[PDB]
Amino acid sequence: NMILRYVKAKADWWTNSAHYNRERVRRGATVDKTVCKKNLGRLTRLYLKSEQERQHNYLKDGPYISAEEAVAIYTTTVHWLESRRFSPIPFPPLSYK
């Protein structure tokens, strides 16, 4: 429990400095390539750290689209493509020209 507190303090400082440095890079208040390259590394991690959450939550929360909506859009494209007479794309023939 002591370790976890300090890791969260290091964490908060680490992310909060990523935010501050990126506002400098957006505004143009910094012209040091190492600061930008550092900060991109931090933000890449902060993205993935949240993307791993998003991919896990999907399997936990299930399909965010209802089965109602999914069959609605599915049937809609069938009615479209049927009325367009769309012939579906075959697999590339063995001797295709």
């Binding site: 069938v78 493509l81 049927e82 769309f86 579906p88």
Partner: peptide, 29 residues
């Protein structure tokens, strides 16, 4: 399991709905 193998091969490897044709029959699982 062979019952459901035969069942899902009627769901997977069919040609597309936009072609028409009769549905493959399925089994009650």
């Amino acid at each position: 399991v062979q019952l459901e193998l035969e069942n899902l091969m009627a769901l997977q490897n069919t040609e597309s709905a936009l072609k028409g044709g009769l549905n493959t029959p399925l089994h009650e699982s």
